Design a protein around this ligand. Structure first.
Ligand code: L77
Length: 259
């Protein structure tokens, strides 16, 4: 691809990320002063474990839906075969959601934007997921040091999703060409912006994958112990991405058609 085609792809990715942002950046930076009271934190702490899980699962599902829209606008993604579109989203949607969260994370007090206000790790104590919640906060703490620009997050989360190493891809070769054109665009943008030192500081690819495994493997421990709660109160999209007996409901293969 030519240099201007590469510049074209940078702008098309950045505009695609602008249009499918769940939260606006200027709103997140003005809410940093809006912090949960200690009594509000205590409210979240005394809530029942299964109620706190459903609450967070729905908020996670809503964020993943904006990632599907992001994929749907990605250059080349909708040109892939559907089975590869599902494989890429089944694996990378939570990863994109975990990277996008670092915008809603305040490194200057180790708080995160949750339900309109910012709060620390102790907000989620009722989940009984101390280690998983810590890994998420530390992951966001690392990305916040990079001081990503919105354009840089656009190209980074694009590559997080368009990955040719994903198990199950039927047309692995076409995803390779997609991944190459995007990393060339990402690298070209970092070169024009004088932000190439970011690449050496980026987290190793495994930490994102290990975070997902940490996340998913913890869910079905909850789904095994509290199975009826998951089938009745957890949202469908969440069960298809993350549950064993939840792939019967077809949800992704309709978000990818209704355009
Ligand atoms: O909550 C979970 N994962 C998740 C991943 C990304 C996002 C959301 C949720 N939400 S959110 O507004 O609720 C929000 C906003 C800041 C921080 C957090 C938290 F990750 F600390 F919970 C959550 C949107 C972005 C979850 C779960 F469903 C089951 C077990 C353990 C966990 Cl962690």
């Amino acid at each position: 691809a030519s240099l201007t085609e590469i510049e074209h792809l940078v702008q098309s990715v950045c505009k695609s990320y602008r249009e499918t942002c769940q939260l606006r950046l200027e709103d997140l930076l003005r809410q940093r002063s809006n912090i949960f009271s200690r009594e509000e934190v205590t409210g979240y702490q005394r809530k029942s474990m299964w109620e706190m899980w459903e609450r967070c699962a729905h908020h996670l599902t809503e964020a993943i839906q904006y990632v599907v829209e992001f994929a749907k606008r990605l250059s080349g993604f909708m040109e892939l075969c559907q089975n590869d579109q599902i494989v890429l989203l089944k694996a990378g949607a939570m990863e994109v959601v975990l990277v996008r969260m670092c915008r809603a994370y305040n490194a200057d007090n180790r708080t995160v934007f949750f339900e309109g206000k910012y709060g620390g790790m102790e907000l989620f104590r009722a989940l009984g997921c101390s280690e998983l919640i810590s890994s998420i906060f530390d992951f966001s703490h690392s990305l916040s040091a990079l001081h990503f620009s919105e354009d840089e997050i656009a190209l980074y989360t694009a590559l997080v999703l368009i990955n040719a190493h994903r198990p199950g891809l039927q047309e692995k070769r076409k995803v390779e060409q997609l991944q190459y054109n995007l990393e060339l665009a990402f690298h070209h943008h970092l070169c024009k912006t004088h932000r190439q030192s970011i690449l050496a500081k980026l987290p190793p690819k495994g930490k994102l994958r290990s975070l997902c495994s940490q996340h998913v493997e913890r869910l079905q421990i909850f789904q095994h112990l509290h199975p009826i709660v998951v089938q009745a109160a957890f949202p469908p999209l969440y069960k298809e991405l993350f549950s064993g007996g939840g792939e019967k409901h077809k949800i992704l293969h309709r978000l990818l058609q209704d355009s």
